[PDB]
């Protein structure tokens, strides 16, 4: 997966935040801009075979 600009997602989040009056932080980005990208990129993971088998209820067993 390729995020074409996470720079212009931070800007869009700053916009949609200030319009809700939420208090800003450094460089006027919202308080939790770090959390915005953190909880996104932490989904990029390699997942071991038991998680796959448990999620997929046994339909796939050998794979990661």
């Amino acid at each position: 997966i390729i995020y074409d600009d996470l720079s212009k997602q931070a800007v869009a989040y700053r916009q949609i935040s200030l319009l809700l009056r939420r208090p800003p932080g450094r460089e006027a980005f919202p308080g939790d801009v770090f959390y915005l990208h953190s909880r996104l990129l932490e989904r990029a993971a390699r997942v071991n075979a038991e998680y796959v088998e448990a999620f997929t209820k046994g339909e796939v067993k050998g794979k990661t």
Partner: protein
């Protein structure tokens, strides 16, 4: 001020530090080459001085002018200077020593004449008003004996023409890579060598045509060789001084980056605080 101007200034000082490091390395290589070209000069002057010793104080001796003193009515100086700056105090220590001794001699009421090797001394002694009678300039790091023949010819011609009574070469001495010292040393009339006539009786030369004509050219070639050796030593000394001066300048730049960064951090923090306060205090 404001974080951006200071970040620009820090960029430019880092660039200055790169440049002076490069010049340090360049001078550090040219110094080794210069002190090699310095060693290749010794044999000629050493053997020619042995020959002059034989013809001067061997079992016979001659009345040649260059070998015995007379009344000092005026003095000549051959001044070696660098062609390039950024060498630190090299040139000015030398010129100050020269000026002191020229003042001594002019107190005794004897004039002095200057012949210049290198353009820095030319400009200096023009601005100070000394008597510059001949010059050669722009040799750079390719000194060649064929370009020194001019000024030393002038000074020798004026010596045997009776218009000079003593002749000096003023130049730096590449003692060691960390230390160079300006020296004013006499080369006419000829210094009394650490030699003994006792060894001479073993043999003598078949002079063709005759010794009185040979001794003249020997002494002229010897003086030329010593001016050339002084020039090459001054060049090696220049390279060493530029190396150490650029070392000092690179450390001075590095120690200034760390002040500018304190200023920059303080301004960064100040701008964040002011902006965020102007937002939060405008709401409601």
């Amino acid at each position: 001020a404001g974080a951006k101007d200071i970040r620009s200034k820090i960029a430019s000082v880092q660039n200055t530090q790169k440049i002076t490091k490069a010049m340090e390395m360049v001078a550090a290589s040219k110094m080794r080459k210069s002190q090699d070209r310095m060693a290749a000069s010794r044999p000629y002057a050493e053997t020619m001085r042995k020959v002059i010793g034989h013809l001067a104080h061997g079992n016979l001796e001659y009345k040649h002018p260059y070998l015995e003193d007379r009344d000092v009515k005026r003095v000549g100086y051959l001044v070696v200077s660098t062609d390039r700056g950024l060498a630190g105090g090299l040139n000015i220590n030398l010129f100050k020593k020269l000026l002191a001794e020229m003042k001594t001699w002019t107190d005794k009421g004897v004039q002095a004449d200057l012949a210049m090797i290198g353009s820095k001394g030319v400009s200096f002694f023009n601005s100070v008003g000394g008597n510059v009678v001949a010059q050669v300039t722009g040799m750079g790091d390719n000194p060649s004996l064929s370009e020194l023949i001019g000024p030393v010819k002038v000074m020798l011609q004026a010596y045997d023409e009776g218009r000079l009574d003593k002749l000096y070469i003023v130049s730096n001495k590449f003692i060691n890579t960390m230390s160079q010292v300006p020296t004013i040393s006499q080369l006419l009339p000829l210094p009394a060598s650490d030699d003994d006539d006792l060894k001479h009786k073993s043999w003598d030369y078949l002079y063709e045509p005759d010794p009185k004509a040979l001794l003249d050219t020997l002494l002229r070639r010897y003086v030329e060789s010593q001016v050339y050796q002084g020039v090459v030593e001054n060049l090696a000394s220049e390279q060493a001084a530029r190396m150490v001066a650029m070392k000092a300048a690179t450390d001075n730049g590095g120690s200034l980056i760390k002040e500018l960064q304190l200023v920059y951090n303080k301004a960064r923090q100040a701008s964040i605080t002011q902006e965020l306060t102007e937002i939060v205090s405008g709401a409601a």
